[PDB]
Each structure stands twice: as C-alpha cells, then as structure tokens.
Amino acid sequence: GPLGSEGPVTVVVAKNYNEIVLDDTKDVLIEFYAPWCGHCKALAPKYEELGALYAKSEFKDRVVIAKVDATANDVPDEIQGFPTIKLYPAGAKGQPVTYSGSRTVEDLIKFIAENGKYKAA
Template sequence: MRTFFALLLVALVSANSEGLVSLNPDNFKTYQNSGKTLLVKFFAPWCGHCKRLAPTYEEVAQAFAENEDVIIAEVNCDDHRELCQEHGIRGFPTVLVFNGEESKKFQEQRTVEELKKFVLENVPAKN
C-alpha cells in the first residue's frame, strides 16, 4: 500500500500543469513498465533545436493529458547523462516512444500533427 502511494506521489509531483512528466533514473522504469505508451523527449537545456521543439512538445502533452493510454515525458540529459546513454541518445532532441522495453525513434517533421500521429500509431490495440 505504501508503494502505491509513493508511486502516486511521484506521478503527481513529476507531471507539470501541461501533463508533461519529468523522468529521471528513479522513475523511468516505473513509467516505462506502466503498460501505457510512453513518448519521451531526451533533451539538453542549451540545445537550440530542443528550445524550438519545447512549445510543440508541450502542446502534444496537453493533447494527450486526458488520454489514459499515453504518457508524454521528457528527460534532461544534462541532469541525467547515464540514463540518456543507456538509451543510446547521441543527439538532441531525440524522441522515442516506448511500449514496455521496446522503443522506436521518431524521425518525422517535428510538428504537433506528426508527433500526435506517431503516438497514436504506436498505441497498442486494445483487446
């Protein structure tokens, strides 16, 4: 029971008002293995491309804020270098979608429409 409340607290504290979750080494696996589709932006705060993507990515997070099957998240690679290395991040921003341990890289234009389409294409069909 304590574990449940601890995870709930982490989820509430980690998500900002736009529905965007900040991931770190302590909570990444919990979200990755949540049974939900997890879209993760790996970024560096000093990166110009990352700064340009930020408002678009926040809009995507808002679009999926009420979707119980999707989590939109980000990892600050300056703060969590080992986590980014573990996922093979070599450039910024890198966006990956996770369904459990399996991941797929986003390689389309960085628009709200393309990111939303990518997420929806990677949500497993419900039985």
C-alpha cells in the first residue's frame, strides 16, 4: 500500500550471482549496467518494468529477472561496455543470448520467450 515502489527487480550480487544464473530449473534474465552511464538510465525503467511484470504476474515462481552492476561483483561474463542483456534458458546451461543493443521493450520481452527454454512470457 504505502510503499509500492523500491526493490522492483531481483537483486543479483557476487554472493548469489552463481546460484542464480546457475538455476537452470527456471528462466534467468541478467542485465548489466553502470551507475554512471546515461544510456543505462533510460534502459533502467524499461528493464525494471518487464522485470517485475512476469517476475510476479506470469512466471512468479518460474522466472527470475535481476540486474547487476559492472562496478563490483561476480559478473564472470565479459562485456564490451555494459548495456548488456543475457538470457539463460531453463535446462540449457550453455546457450546464453547476447543483445546487440536494446531498441524497445516489446523486443526484450519477445526475446525472453523466444530464446528462453521456459518461454518466460
């Protein structure tokens, strides 16, 4: 009620980065960004919306969309910059998709269900 915002997306830190992305029993969506980057700010509200969208509405107990920062944490995966979007298909621990630049939200959603093994959408 009084507090509806705050903590909208799932949090993934080096302390639980592996346990999460590893979870093949469910759909995982990790997005890396920088707290100083501007382009990331615009993608912040977008990725945050769709995140909680299915995270609780459709795949409440099947999908997990979290966002990590390149400042300090696990992030074993390499990055050219940051504005990155990876999707781990449930059951396929070796087929993470890599976005070449988010253009819209409709594309990010259709991707999770397209590349995602669980079809989180």
